[PDB]
Amino acid sequence: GSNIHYTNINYYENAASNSLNKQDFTQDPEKFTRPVVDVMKEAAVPLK
Amino acid sequence: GSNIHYTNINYYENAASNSLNKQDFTQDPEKFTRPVVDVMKEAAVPLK
Amino acid sequence: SAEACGYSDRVAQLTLGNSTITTQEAANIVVGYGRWPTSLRDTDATAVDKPTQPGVSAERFYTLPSVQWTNSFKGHYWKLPDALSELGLFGQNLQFHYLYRGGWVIHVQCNATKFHQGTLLVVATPEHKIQSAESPAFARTNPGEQGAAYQFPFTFEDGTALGNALIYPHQWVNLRTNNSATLVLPYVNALPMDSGIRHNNWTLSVIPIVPLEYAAGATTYVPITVTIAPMCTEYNGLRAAVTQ
Amino acid sequence: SAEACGYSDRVAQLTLGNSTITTQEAANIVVGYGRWPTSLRDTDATAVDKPTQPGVSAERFYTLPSVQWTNSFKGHYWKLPDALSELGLFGQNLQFHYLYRGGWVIHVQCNATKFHQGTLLVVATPEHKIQSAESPAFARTNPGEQGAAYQFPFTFEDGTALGNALIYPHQWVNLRTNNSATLVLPYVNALPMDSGIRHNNWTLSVIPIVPLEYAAGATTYVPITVTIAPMCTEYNGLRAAVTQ
Amino acid sequence: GQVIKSAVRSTVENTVQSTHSITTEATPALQAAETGATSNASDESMIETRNVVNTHGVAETSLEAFYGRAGLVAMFSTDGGIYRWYINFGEYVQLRAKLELLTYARFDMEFTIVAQVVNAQSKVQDFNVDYQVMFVPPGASVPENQDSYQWQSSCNPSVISNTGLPPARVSVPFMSSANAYSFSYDGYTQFGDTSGSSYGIVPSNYLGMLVVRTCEDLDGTRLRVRVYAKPKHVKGWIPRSPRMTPYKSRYTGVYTDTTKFCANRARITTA
Amino acid sequence: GQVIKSAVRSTVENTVQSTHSITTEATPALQAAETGATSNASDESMIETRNVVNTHGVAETSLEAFYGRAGLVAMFSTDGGIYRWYINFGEYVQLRAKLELLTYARFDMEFTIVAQVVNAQSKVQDFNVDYQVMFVPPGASVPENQDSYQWQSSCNPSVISNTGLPPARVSVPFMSSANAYSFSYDGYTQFGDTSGSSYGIVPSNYLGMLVVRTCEDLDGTRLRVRVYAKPKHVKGWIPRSPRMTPYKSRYTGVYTDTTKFCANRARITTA
Amino acid sequence: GIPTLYTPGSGQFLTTDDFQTPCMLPKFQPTPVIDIPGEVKNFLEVVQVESLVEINNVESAEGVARYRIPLNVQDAMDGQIMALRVDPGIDGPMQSTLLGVFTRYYAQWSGSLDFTFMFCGTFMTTGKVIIAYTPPGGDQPTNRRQAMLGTHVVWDFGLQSSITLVVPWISSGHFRGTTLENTIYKYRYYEAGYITMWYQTNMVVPPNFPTTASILMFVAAQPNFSLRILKDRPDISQEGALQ
Amino acid sequence: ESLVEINNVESAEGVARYRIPLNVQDAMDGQIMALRVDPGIDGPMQSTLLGVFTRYYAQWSGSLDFTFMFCGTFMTTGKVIIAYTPPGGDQPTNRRQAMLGTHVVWDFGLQSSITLVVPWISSGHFRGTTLENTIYKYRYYEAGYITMWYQTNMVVPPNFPTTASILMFVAAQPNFSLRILKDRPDISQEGALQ
Numbered sequence A, B: 001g002s003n004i005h006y007t008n009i010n011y012y013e014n015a016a017s018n019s020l021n022k023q024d025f026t027q028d029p030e031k032f033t034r035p036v037v038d039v040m041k042e043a044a045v046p047l048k
Numbered sequence C, D: 001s002a003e004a005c006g007y008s009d010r011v012a013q014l015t016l017g018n019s020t021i022t023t024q025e026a027a028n029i030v031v032g033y034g035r036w037p038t039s040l041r042d043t044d045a046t047a048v049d050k051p052t053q054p055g056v057s058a059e060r061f062y063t064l065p066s067v068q069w070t071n072s073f074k075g076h077y078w079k080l081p082d083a084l085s086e087l088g089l090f091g092q093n094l095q096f097h098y099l100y101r102g103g104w105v106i107h108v109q110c111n112a113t114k115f116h117q118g119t120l121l122v123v124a125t126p127e128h129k130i131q132s133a134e135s136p137a138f139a140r141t142n143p144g145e146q147g148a149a150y151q152f153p154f155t156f157e158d159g160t161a162l163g164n165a166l167i168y169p170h171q172w173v174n175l176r177t178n179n180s181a182t183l184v185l186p187y188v189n190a191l192p193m194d195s196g197i198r199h200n201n202w203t204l205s206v207i208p209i210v211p212l213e214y215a216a217g218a219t220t221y222v223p224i225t226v227t228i229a230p231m232c233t234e235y236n237g238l239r240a241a242v243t244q
Numbered sequence E, F: 001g002q003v004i005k006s007a008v009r010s011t012v013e014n015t016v017q018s019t020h021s022i023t024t025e026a027t028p029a030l031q032a033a034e035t036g037a038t039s040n041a042s043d044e045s046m047i048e049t050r051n052v053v054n055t056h057g058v059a060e061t062s063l064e065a066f067y068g069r070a071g072l073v074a075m076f077s078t079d080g081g082i083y084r085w086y087i088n089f090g091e092y093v094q095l096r097a098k099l100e101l102l103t104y105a106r107f108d109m110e111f112t113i114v115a116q117v118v119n120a121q122s123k124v125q126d127f128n129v130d131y132q133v134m135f136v137p138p139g140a141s142v143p144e145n146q147d148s149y150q151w152q153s154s155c156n157p158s159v160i161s162n163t164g165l166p167p168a169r170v171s172v173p174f175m176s177s178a179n180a181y182s183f184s185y186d187g188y189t190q191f192g193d194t195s196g197s198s199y200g201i202v203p204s205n206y207l208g209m210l211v212v213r214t215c216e217d218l219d220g221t222r223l224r225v226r227v228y229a230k231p232k233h234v235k236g237w238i239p240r241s242p243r244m245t246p247y248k249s250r251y252t253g254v255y256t257d258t259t260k261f262c263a264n265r266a267r268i269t270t271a
Numbered sequence G: 001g002i003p004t005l006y007t008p009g010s011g012q013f014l015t016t017d018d019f020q021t022p023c024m025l026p027k028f029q030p031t032p033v034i035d036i037p038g039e040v041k042n043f044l045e046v047v048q049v050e051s052l053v054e055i056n057n058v059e060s061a062e063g064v065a066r067y068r069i070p071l072n073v074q075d076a077m078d079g080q081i082m083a084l085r086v087d088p089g090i091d092g093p094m095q096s097t098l099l100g101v102f103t104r105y106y107a108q109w110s111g112s113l114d115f116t117f118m119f120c121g122t123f124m125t126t127g128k129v130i131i132a133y134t135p136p137g138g139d140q141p142t143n144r145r146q147a148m149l150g151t152h153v154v155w156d157f158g159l160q161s162s163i164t165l166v167v168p169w170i171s172s173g174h175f176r177g178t179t180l181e182n183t184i185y186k187y188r189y190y191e192a193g194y195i196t197m198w199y200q201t202n203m204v205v206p207p208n209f210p211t212t213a214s215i216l217m218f219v220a221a222q223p224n225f226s227l228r229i230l231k232d233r234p235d236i237s238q239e240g241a242l243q
Numbered sequence H: 001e002s003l004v005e006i007n008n009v010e011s012a013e014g015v016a017r018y019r020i021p022l023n024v025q026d027a028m029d030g031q032i033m034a035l036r037v038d039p040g041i042d043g044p045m046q047s048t049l050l051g052v053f054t055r056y057y058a059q060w061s062g063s064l065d066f067t068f069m070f071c072g073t074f075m076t077t078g079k080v081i082i083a084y085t086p087p088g089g090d091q092p093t094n095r096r097q098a099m100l101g102t103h104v105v106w107d108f109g110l111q112s113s114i115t116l117v118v119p120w121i122s123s124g125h126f127r128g129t130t131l132e133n134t135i136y137k138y139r140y141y142e143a144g145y146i147t148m149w150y151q152t153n154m155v156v157p158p159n160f161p162t163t164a165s166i167l168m169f170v171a172a173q174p175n176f177s178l179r180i181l182k183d184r185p186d187i188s189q190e191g192a193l194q
């Protein structure tokens, strides 16, 4: 996978010149998968 | 915008060889916009 | 207790300004992208004039003309803010200003009986284009308060799959389960504010995916009603009234 | 310095909302009964709904159609809020609400030359009745933005002496001295709020007491212009738009 | 007003061993799609699971990994030694469909230009020639000929290279007047006009044009040019429903209606 | 004797929220252009404003950002294998108009040379040839032929490259005998002469000439050359009124009189 | 000059390369990033969102009707309702879903899948159905008895309208190819199995009620799902320049 | 500040093009002038300092300073209203419509000039400098209009000139900036220069 050690020096003035970002993580998808006001726990019934 | 970190080492003897300046700020334009001896405050009338 | 037991109560009350909406058969409440409406931050703003914030005069529920769930019903849609551009003080503030910003609280209503079956997808789509025609008609891109009937539901009027519209804030009105859908929507755009007469940020669609059927002899006339409230609004660039 | 020397500077700037008014020949500024406009106190209020406070959308200067200072000119008057009932968002808020409360900033304009002479009384009268007729005509009690011409200036249209109108907030536009009058008016009524379509709290009158005369050959066409700004307004009892 | 948090993760979720469950209390399997929420039933609650320390990463699906590679956006041949290309990504469908997966996005771009000489019969030639690609922002004068004064390019940025050198390449920042590019716009291009041709296009997405020429006249041959674009430093908002119909026009999302997406099978009971 | 200060800023000015104002004291709107001063009425004083933390930069309008890019200054073809170009920036109008926006300026320059072979019909050739660009300062002997002794260039700086290599490029310092170059000179070139042809030109702006040749003789073809110049490390003084008429001569600012700059409209009351 | 030796690859244009390059506008300052709802950082956030499966992909079903699984009052027991290969990237009912589209942008996948079903009959319409996942090895189960030997859930129609059948990741290898193309690559090797639905009891209704009803089918990736090796989506193509 | 070539009509040549005509009226609420506020488009603004530099760039942002100086006799009076109409529709048709927007009421007097600030009121942080429509559909960016009307009337003593002039100045405010350099369209050549 990705190297734990590698050179990352910027040679140019503008950030647009920089190489690709190297984060690549993901975030909890709840804003898309469960955009609801009331919490509906996995162990309970959804509606009552 | 501009990188907060980037290499700036000069490889040549004469300053004329150097890359472009990286300041780019502006200055108060009063020497051109208000080249007058008497101060005329914004809240007062110009002439009396 | 709903919170203690970890479930959502089927009853709800929505109160904004001088208006209160209730339902006894809800299915929780959706808050688009998990974000409630918010005011424009000083660090995001660009228009320099002090904005107008009408408050309760515009942030209240407006009920639009009902639509019938006919046998050949393909669905119906309303553009926002277009649909309310001529209703109350919200409409007036929208017309008198070049710039507008705001969120919404949408409540879609459709009751039948325990003897009826049918399922409506209620979805709020950001930047929903009605592009099935080579040259879209203004009557369909901006249908006003009456809204417009769907002609191409399967392709969502935009060349995408109806089944994937679930990626947008939505709920379903499945008659055996609920008779209403409620969605809170934040302002969404690539700009801090925009013109309420040239751009519709959201489009509310109510689409039947499971046709309305019922025990023989039951009431056949089943309306669908939309009640919408602007929320956390602000306007800039005051001048005379101008409509699209 | 005006404050240090104890005099009033003849120049003035009035800025409200997106509007700025200036004059270089003022005669101080009158503040009716020494009171600036104020919001309704919780201890004086009776209507229980949260009020709408439109802010800059309505609290700004509105210029009405000018009136000519003709040779036979007897004077002109405008009722408030009647005159602005159909102008901008102030008018809309006034129409959409049963109740309205607010103050005013009035700027009357009339310039001529150092070769002209004439004197106008500029007075803001609370509860000014146009009662010279057995049955007052609506066209005269509520003349709208165009205002109405005086027919009985000497009796102030109400059976009192014109000369005693000075008991009300006023200024004079005496051409040799100034070309404008400015008056700030607080809300006045025997009630906390009232209907903007059934009651006019103030009446602005501009009456010539010294006829317009001038050196032979000078410009004869001299207009009078009124620019008025609602100030510190609030509205209650929202519903559909209703005009008188 | 954000009520839903978004914690970051660098690996997919582990599986924890689970045991049987016989109760009236916990019912993970019971759901209600009407709420608008995706099921929250976990693997461990539906079956008895084992422990799985899952170190599978999530990098290749990040916006940077998905968009961070070059794709064709323009392809043309000069005529009279010149060609004017209006910068837009609707001509070639692959990159276009990718971008439309997001409603709004900010990103810098790396443009790579590959050019070579071809004859009248479109046969490639081994011929090294200098070419110039000039970026003309809206409002600037566009050259009418191969030798017009605008090629002086004292202000317009230009890149001069040779078909004998490696492909030319330059980066461009996020240039929109907006705070993000829009790949879906439900509005019109101007006030006072509601014609269909002015619908669904946000003008701020158009930053100008690229005009290309050979520095000197080719004798009977033409310059063939391909322009590739690679998004960089991508920030995106509001995922969209993917294109599910063929594209037909370069500037609009018009499509041909259809009664099905996937092909039919004999019966719903036979996989 | 500088009474007006010039503090530096890296962003434009913020907007601070303001409220109404009803007074005889402060009158920001009243002005008097006769004083020679530009109005000092601020946004906050003319209307009620909101708070706007404005982070818009000012970089692209700095002298370095405005001038810091290459522009064409010379373009020619050899004759007899040689060409003599007197160094001056009045031939091509784009860079010329930019420089005339300042009265005085100091700057270094980066010169870039793009060359290729063309035939008698001006058709470009794929032909690699060595060429020499020699800087001949005033007073030094200028070669008359492609093979004259001056090409030995033992003191004159020369750059030898090939049409098959990338464009040649060299930097030059601020070379004027003056303390700044002048882009406007209301005087004559010499004492004892008041002829019109000696007016408006400051001789110190002319540093010599560039003589170009191919190292060996081309057979029937010629060398086409373009010279670009890019100012660097710019320091400028006294902004000037921009050129508003077409240029007509390379060495003078002569122009054709005109009765209007912008085109006419039907009436002043219709925007 | 520093002595250097250039190597193979020099001058090449690898579309996935990642170098720093000069900017056309070195001093350009972009507009500020403003607060916009719905930021997404990874497409795994999208595939975890449920979307409808075009399950009834038969000749008699057009448009919207293709999303409905037909259910009807039976007069026989243990009957079948539907069947489908669970593979998210192959041609079929899954190809037009959110999960399917993104899976088709990649060559390999891994992870459990969430298949959720919502019953849409009347409040009075009851029924129990069994949904089973059959891990690979043979053909789809021929009857309910064979199907129930695999992973499954028994669904009871009631107030909670939906049920979830998790198709857990059960694979020999950590990843599977997204296509099962056989003629060239022999990728049938990767088949993930089948999902089938059967009547557990029967759909039962009161007098004069509709004797047919529908079930909507949703699918999404679980939290342990990931994709590798980007590839062009086969559904997006063109035969010439666009108007 | 630099002068706007505001009276760009057939009957005005050279220096006269900088003068906004004013005259004693015999009717009320009349219009005096109108102009799109966009600093980079063809028209009265193109030859100003602000216009020239704006034309060297593709995008702009910021409030604008429009200052006017009355040049009639000391005895000539008058009040005029200058309004800025944010975009959405066409230029205001009458004074009543115009005054609903941002405006200033100017009183002729000792202080000869008045400033109307056209505040930056835009959907986006920047606007394109051209409104070219056929190709880019940039009419999208129109910034609105500035119009001037008689608030009262221009009034003069016996035998005085019944016509007078107003000079119009424009400049960028402190929150103004430009982005993306481009060649100024006004500078061109058809061949080598003499």
Ligand SMILES: CCCCCCCCCCCCCCCCCC(=O)O
Pocket (backbone or CB within 6 Å): E087, E088, E089, E090, E109, E111, E133, E134, E135, E157, E158, E159, E170, E172, E175, E181, E182, E205, E206, E207, E208, E210, G024
């Ligand atoms: C001189 C170097 C030439 C290199 C090319 C520079 C191109 C500058 C334009 C950059 C804009 C790219 C973003 C466009 C995205 C919107 C596309 C669309 O909606 O069709």
Ligand SMILES: CCCCCCCCCCCCCCCCCC(=O)O
Pocket (backbone or CB within 6 Å): F087, F088, F089, F090, F109, F111, F133, F134, F135, F157, F158, F159, F170, F172, F175, F181, F182, F205, F206, F207, F208, F210
């Ligand atoms: C051997 C390398 C050749 C490179 C070229 C060197 C050129 C040296 C001359 C530098 C002078 C440049 C400044 C001239 C500015 C004044 C121009 C004008 O007023 O017309």
Ligand SMILES: N[C@@H](CCC(=O)N[C@@H](CS)C(=O)NCC(=O)O)C(=O)O
Pocket (backbone or CB within 6 Å): E072, E075, E092, E226, G238, G239, G240, G241
């Ligand atoms: N055969 C024609 C047309 C080819 C063409 O335009 N092909 C399109 C697809 S229909 C393409 O995307 N080509 C990719 C490429 O050649 O790089 C030509 O070569 O001029």
Ligand SMILES: N[C@@H](CCC(=O)N[C@@H](CS)C(=O)NCC(=O)O)C(=O)O
Pocket (backbone or CB within 6 Å): E146, E147, E148, E149, E150, E151, E152, F072, F075, F092, F226, H189, H190, H191, H192
């Ligand atoms: N057609 C002639 C004349 C062309 C010419 O001199 N063009 C001028 C403008 S009139 C120019 O600036 N050209 C820029 C360039 O070719 O780089 C030639 O090519 O020799």
Ligand SMILES: [K+]
Pocket (backbone or CB within 6 Å): C053, C054, C055, D052, D053, D054
């Ligand atoms: K308020």
Ligand SMILES: [K+]
Pocket (backbone or CB within 6 Å): C052, C053, C054, D053, D054, D055
């Ligand atoms: K308020």
Ligand SMILES: [K+]
Pocket (backbone or CB within 6 Å): E011, E012, E013, E014, E053, E054, E055
């Ligand atoms: K893990």
Ligand SMILES: [K+]
Pocket (backbone or CB within 6 Å): A041, A042, A043, A044, A045, A046, E027, E028, E029, E030, E031
């Ligand atoms: K559950």
Ligand SMILES: [K+]
Pocket (backbone or CB within 6 Å): E038, E039, E040, E041, G114, G220, G221, G222
């Ligand atoms: K799930």
Ligand SMILES: [K+]
Pocket (backbone or CB within 6 Å): F011, F012, F013, F014, F053, F054, F055
């Ligand atoms: K700042």
Ligand SMILES: [K+]
Pocket (backbone or CB within 6 Å): B041, B042, B043, B044, B045, B046, F027, F028, F029, F030, F031
């Ligand atoms: K002042």
Ligand SMILES: [K+]
Pocket (backbone or CB within 6 Å): F038, F039, F040, F041, H065, H171, H172, H173
């Ligand atoms: K100023």
